[PDB]
Subunit: 392 residues, 4 copies
Amino acid sequence: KPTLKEVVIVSATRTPIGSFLGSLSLLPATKLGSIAIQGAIEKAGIPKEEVKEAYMGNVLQGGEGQAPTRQAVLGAGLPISTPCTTINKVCASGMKAIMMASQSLMCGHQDVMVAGGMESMSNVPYVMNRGSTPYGGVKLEDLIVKDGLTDVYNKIHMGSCAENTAKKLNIARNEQDAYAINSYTRSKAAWEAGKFGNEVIPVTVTVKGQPDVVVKEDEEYKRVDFSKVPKLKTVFQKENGTVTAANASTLNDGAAALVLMTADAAKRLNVTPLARIVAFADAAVEPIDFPIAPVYAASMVLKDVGLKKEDIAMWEVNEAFSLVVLANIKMLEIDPQKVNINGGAVSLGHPIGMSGARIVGHLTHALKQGEYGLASICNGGGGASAMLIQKL
Amino acid sequence: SKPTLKEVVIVSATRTPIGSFLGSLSLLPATKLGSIAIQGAIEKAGIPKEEVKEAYMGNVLQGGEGQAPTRQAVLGAGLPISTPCTTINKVCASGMKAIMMASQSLMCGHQDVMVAGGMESMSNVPYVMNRGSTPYGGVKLEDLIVKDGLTDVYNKIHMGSCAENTAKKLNIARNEQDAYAINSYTRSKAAWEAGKFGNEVIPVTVTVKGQPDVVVKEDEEYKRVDFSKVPKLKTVFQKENGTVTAANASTLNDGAAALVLMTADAAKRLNVTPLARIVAFADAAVEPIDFPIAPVYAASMVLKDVGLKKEDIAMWEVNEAFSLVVLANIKMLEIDPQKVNINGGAVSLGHPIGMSGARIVGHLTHALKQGEYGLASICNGGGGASAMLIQKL
Amino acid sequence: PTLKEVVIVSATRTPIGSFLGSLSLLPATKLGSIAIQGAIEKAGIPKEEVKEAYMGNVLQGGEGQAPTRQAVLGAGLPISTPCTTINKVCASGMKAIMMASQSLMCGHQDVMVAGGMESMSNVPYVMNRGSTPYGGVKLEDLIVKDGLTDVYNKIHMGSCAENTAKKLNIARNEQDAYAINSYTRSKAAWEAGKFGNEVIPVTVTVKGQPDVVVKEDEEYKRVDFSKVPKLKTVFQKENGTVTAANASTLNDGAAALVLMTADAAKRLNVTPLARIVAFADAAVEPIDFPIAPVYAASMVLKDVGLKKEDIAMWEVNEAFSLVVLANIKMLEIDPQKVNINGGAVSLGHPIGMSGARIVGHLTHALKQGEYGLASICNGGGGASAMLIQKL
Amino acid sequence: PTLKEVVIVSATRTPIGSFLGSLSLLPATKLGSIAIQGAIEKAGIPKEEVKEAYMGNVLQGGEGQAPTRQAVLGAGLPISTPCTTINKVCASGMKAIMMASQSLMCGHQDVMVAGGMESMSNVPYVMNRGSTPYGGVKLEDLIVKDGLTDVYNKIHMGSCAENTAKKLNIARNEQDAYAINSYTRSKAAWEAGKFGNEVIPVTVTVKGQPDVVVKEDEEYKRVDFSKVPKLKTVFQKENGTVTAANASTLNDGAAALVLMTADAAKRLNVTPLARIVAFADAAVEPIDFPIAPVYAASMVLKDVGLKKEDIAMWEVNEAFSLVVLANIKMLEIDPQKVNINGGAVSLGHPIGMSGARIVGHLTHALKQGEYGLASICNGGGGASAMLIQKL
Ligand SMILES: [Cl-]
Ligand SMILES: [Cl-]
Ligand SMILES: [Cl-]
Ligand SMILES: [Cl-]
Ligand SMILES: [K+]
Ligand SMILES: [K+]
Ligand SMILES: [K+]
Ligand SMILES: [K+]
């Protein structure tokens, strides 16, 4: 069995998450990426020159220009000698980036890296095929819908795949609506309690001839009306539906970044690590059955390390849909009071390439010394990633 | 202290033919070419499809391909639904970077068998229109090949225009570039007529309803040349004192490559004969405009890491993004030209950008003799390069 | 003053090209210049004698500012020539001649050019001004949107024809027989050289290519009679009657006439071809456009006290085979006197041009003393008609 | 038969809305229906008496089949009403009234509606038919391509205007003073209730929100006199004079007039507002469009045998402040008689409508027996002019 370098997280920072066409919509994903990368190096207390390589998750790259990760990195003022790779595992991209960076560090191939995710759904373009215009016209397709939200094999929206799981596991509209209100409640309380003080950095939006706007908290959690929640119409299934706009995640803009290093490099640089990356895994199922893939990924991680579900102090199961979280709670049989305790994607929003990084960053700050955190995240195609960390 | 890692071997390397832009393979999406190459490689390796645990594919222009390009390629090759997939974008270096990242996973003992490679259908890359309000006076529809593929962000100019900068700096003139180009076409033709791609390339059946089937069995781009016209062509990337032409630059193309990678232990367990050993690899980056020299630094890093000398390398694959790039690498490293790009390269064979990094590694795997060392390097937009060293078993 | 008598001095046209075919490289305005220059030449007058110009042109999007001004200046007419572009859909080319005649009748001008032009090959697609809707953006075809869709009923012109086929009991086999007869007559007239004075050749010039001379209508050769009764009914899948073969096609072309008062014709000593006797517009319920030409033609006959039997030649624009059969059925006229040298089903239908072409064709084909009546339906339920007498 | 006398019985218009402003949810044809129905109600005649309709409309792309027919049927006029859409660029609304007057004069109809309509807010973008070129393409704005760019010089109308500014020595400060004058006259006319009989209100209804009643022109309030001299000369960088403030703006609106023969007005017991005396078109070098209205007006005066002093009020369309000043200078007329209640620079310029608006304004503002002269330049180097006398 290989003898590997130990991998630690020294910082984890993110921009606030902006609403679709909302507060951060004038900023390209690469600029949000630059902001999170700069913030994370500042918080790590290290020279920018120490960062050897960068990986960033980013699902909808069309129209962002050549090499998005290179743009974010050079935009953050890191050396032109820094190699860059952009990662796409759909909704899992931000986590898979951290995983792959960890593997490089484990091998001794680099001693310090930046890893995370970025997405500007506000700036995702429409496409027109190459070739000749057909008589009678054409619809130009929305890349959010075509590349981001539509299952290739079933030719249906992610939300309609979720209805499939709602059926099999008997997870009703009222249960999903209750989970959703719970998420919005938890997000608000966390923000009010100042729980994001270290994690989130403000972004100043500048427009020539107009006043500056400082965006210092997540935009999405205030965009709800609890009285309307149970009256909303089910968009992805008109007949016997359970998923709505309120209980599903939303379209958003944001970036997150982590400074990762070997335990050795943390010592050399006289920095105090926050958590240790212990294990991680990918699992896959039938594409339509993506909501349950995180069950299997999580069990793999637990089994690999020889821990039991009860050993986990804090769970982050990405809230792609309220259904997804409930499906995981049911199948794993874990205590819901330990799941997504400070809100999640249903109320905070889902910039798809960054969510995987955000949830790992959140565990890092929220866990108490010695406690174990497990983050898992489903993705388009029938996949999931999961990661176990231990607070230091 | 250095970690103790698993040994990684190449068990098979397989590719589609490379088709010209809007040419013989243009009806097929990148993901389908991926599925063909992936199935090719599995079959050639003689293992059951269920043995492959995970897949990484390079793919630069993913717009309009649909959700999860790599997952599409993998499921379309009939691999299990249990197989995790990730799509890699290091621009021109993507196909090699996929192999490198897969290798690191194997080294860590996180997987025992994986497929890695690259795929690109430049014929099928779309145009984009921005979200929002239509601006008075007009709306632009940008070409994603130009916008995401070939334009340097920082300098706001084409790759070939950046290339002119290195041509200038190292005094590499039009004639040498043209000579290299003709050399590339010559080698390609020779190799194809000699049957040197007999175990490397698998043929493609193109089916159209009503139409007779087309069987594409060889690379398309190398026949598209006229040596007498080469010196006459205009330098399309710079008005004053140009050297880069369509003839001596790589072309836009479609194709896919896939490699089956495993640990030494897994190759024993499955009773397969490994082709090559993956020894070392590196990434380097310089000023974005200076991308032609990045492979020099990456190659040096690899040699220095393994403690080998340039003279120890039996065969070099320096990606022929531009004739210029190969010449500059030959110059700075002072290696023997007769050992470089022996059976052609991207100037004559084509450059489906996400595929090329995987192709050249796959080529060394088949070309090297028992015990020989091969080094492959590749520049990428933004100022980067990847390099890989292998040894034939 | 008293109303002036109006004469046709010349009438000229380009060949009609197929959709994306022989003339597709030329904009409508350029075809217009070609027709206008040819008509002035045939008239035997200086370009400076032309006082004002009206051209029909339905699909003007993307043609640039003032299409008729472009056609006129492109033909080398004086910068002092006022220009107006006319849109009465399919009736545009005839309506331009009617309005110009009215100006001449008033003594407001003495010599004018009038006609029509269309390049359906070059009609663009449109995108709405505003915010791109989530989920996709629709690019509509102006041919379909402005040219061929009825506003009120939300159906294609071909579906309106199906509606008349139902009401008047005009079957598929009857429409197919008419169409084959149109193709047959077009070919016979070309072979007999009957367009030698009407049509002028067009030279298509491409940088680094050899010149191509287009000398004859393209559309009429594009047919297979054995396949006609097998074609799908595209506007109505169940129990349909209208097909691509028996409907008119999308096309490119221009036509132009030189019109004068009787006084100016005498002053300039030209030999007039025909006198303009009378003209009229009629309109009916939008879906019923195929029958509007019946009322328009009846109006002109009544106005001058002539009976249907007094007419030597009828030009009833062949928008669909259905339209001509409906007109013959309602008017009870001799089919052997209708569209004798083919029409739009086999020659094509550049919509803004056809109304002018059919008037011009009568001017060449009628024998001295004979009356010709031209009528043409238009989208929205309209029709125009004109009666001329050969001099 | 002798020429018939033509009278204006009513003249009505919508408010003019700003680009993407108060009326931007309404299609041009809907504004046309509103103005047409208003004009007929004001005339006090049965709607069935209206025999035919012509409407000016420059930017017809994407409005659907037969825009005039849509306006007409949408106003509830009979389906027996023939319809034609007129395009003489900026002159279209006047040219429609002129052409309709010619039909009446000939005795071809006894009652017509004529006017103009434009919704610049709803003008689309175009993409060429064919295969997309490697490297991408710019979808063109039809307002720019078809409305405002001179074909021959390949520059904006605003840049063509600079040529005349240079030639006649009309400086920036003088153009700015004229512009401020127009805004001032517009406000004062609105405050004095001068449009009470001319303008009808429009109610804009949206599902799930309250009605908005648009009762006055929107444009003249969008100004700050202190900023007028600080604006950039956007049509010519060096030695420029034309700005966004001293040029007309992009707007939405429609206007319609009811026209009759004197005999028809007698038969229907209608008291007409004004008599149409004479009209003319002139044309010069396309770049020199601002001076064409001088020649068109002189033609009309010379035709009728009036001197400039005989004219009580002038409407010279304010396409640019530059145009009005060039006209005042060349004709040597009292500026206090010119565009008395504002004009296009401050009220806006829905291009197909303005030529009709200015004739309708004279019809209301003139005192009994007084002569008014309206003139309007158009892209391509044209102008139309019309003389009326108040009854
Ligand atoms: Cl996956
Ligand atoms: Cl890089
Ligand atoms: Cl009509
Ligand atoms: Cl004109
Ligand atoms: K929600
Ligand atoms: K080449
Ligand atoms: K046909
Ligand atoms: K203004």
